[PDB]
Amino acid sequence: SAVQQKLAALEKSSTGRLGVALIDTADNTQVLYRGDERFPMCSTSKVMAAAAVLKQSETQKQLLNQPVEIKPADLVNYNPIAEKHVNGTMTLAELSAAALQYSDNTAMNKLIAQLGGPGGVTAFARAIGDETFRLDRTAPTLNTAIPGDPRDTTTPRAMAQTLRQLTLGHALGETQRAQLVTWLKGNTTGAASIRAGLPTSWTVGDKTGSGDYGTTNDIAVIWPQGRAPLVLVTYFTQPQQNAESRRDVLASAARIIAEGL
Numbered sequence: 388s389a390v391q392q393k394l395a396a397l398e399k400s401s402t403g404r405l406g407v408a409l410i411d412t413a414d415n416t417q418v419l420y421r422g423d424e425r426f427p428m429c430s431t432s433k434v435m436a437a438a439a440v441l442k443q444s445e446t447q448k449q450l451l452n453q454p455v456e457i458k459p460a461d462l463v464n465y466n467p468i469a470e471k472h473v474n475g476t477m478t479l480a481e482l483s484a485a486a487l488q489y490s491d492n493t494a495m496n497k498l499i500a501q502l503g504g505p506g507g508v509t510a511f512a513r514a515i516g517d518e519t520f521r522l523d524r525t526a527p528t529l530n531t532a533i534p535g536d537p538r539d540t541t542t543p544r545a546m547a548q549t550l551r552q553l554t555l556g557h558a559l560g561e562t563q564r565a566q567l568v569t570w571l572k573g574n575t576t577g578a579a580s581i582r583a584g585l586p587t588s589w590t591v592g593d594k595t596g597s598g599d600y601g602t603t604n605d606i607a608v609i610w611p612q613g614r615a616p617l618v619l620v621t622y623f624t625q626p627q628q629n630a631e632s633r634r635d636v637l638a639s640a641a642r643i644i645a646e647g648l
């Protein structure tokens with residue numbers, strides 16, 4: 388397709404490896420670029436952990452209101468919210484919001500721990516039919532993004548399908564699904580990524596990620612005007628370990644999609 392050709396041109400010009408999956412829910416068509424290759428998720432994996440905790444809350448009724456102690460040993464590399472509550476508590480709802488909306492890595496580790504470790508996050512993915520996602524490490528090391536390493540990876544196609552099931556489909560109960568969508572719409576870290584390639588009148592929920600190798604990721608549910616919602620995954624990684632982040636490349640991928648489909 389013409390969109391695939393433009394994504395290939397974008398990838399070649401940008402000097403990296405680009406993975407894109409678009410689902411258009413108006414007609415369930417899919418546009419993929421390297422859609423079945425594995426990419427490091429980086430912090431985009433926080434969506435799966437938050438969703439798995441919401442799933443737990445369907446049977447543990449007010450689990451989201453439970454206080455969780457934040458201890459010094461919990462702090463990692465980037466903890467903009469949790470660092471204000473060390474030797475205190477945050478609820479699981481507060482940890483989920485911090486993880487999703489600020490990409491707080493300590494908050495993510497509390498979610499992972501609440502699920503029984505990275506294997507528990509992966510088990511949730513399997514339970515909703517995602518056979519591709521794998522979470523193998525906690526924060527911060529899940530973001531190393533070393534080429535050739537299959538840990539903490541998924542494919543664009545699998546992640547787009549899962550994000551659709553979580554936000555638009557039936558993987559979560561109605562209250563939980565609404566809560567996930569509210570959290571994603573409130574993300575603070577995505578203004579330069581997929582959102583920057585879309586008209587400002589469209590509504591977006593997204594979760595970013597970044598890591599070594601200039602890895603720059605974003606996954607989004609988009610509610611345009613005038614048409615049904617879209618699900619878009621954009622993953623990008625580069626050959627040099629200390630390559631600079633390219634959020635603008637993701638914005639350009641989103642613009643190609645939003646103009647071409």
Ligand SMILES: *C(=O)[C@@H](NC(=O)/C(=N\OC(C)(C)C(=O)O)c1csc(N)n1)[C@@H]1N=C(C(=O)O)C(=C)CS1
Nearest residue numbers: 429430465490527528530531576595596597598599
């Ligand atoms: C999610 O992807 C998280 N990423 C990281 O913790 C790591 N790096 O983030 C960047 C911004 C690239 C950094 O230079 O520190 C990381 C862990 S281990 C390793 N070798 N790199 C958080 N989420 C993002 C995001 O893109 O949403 C951030 C900007 C903060 S960290």
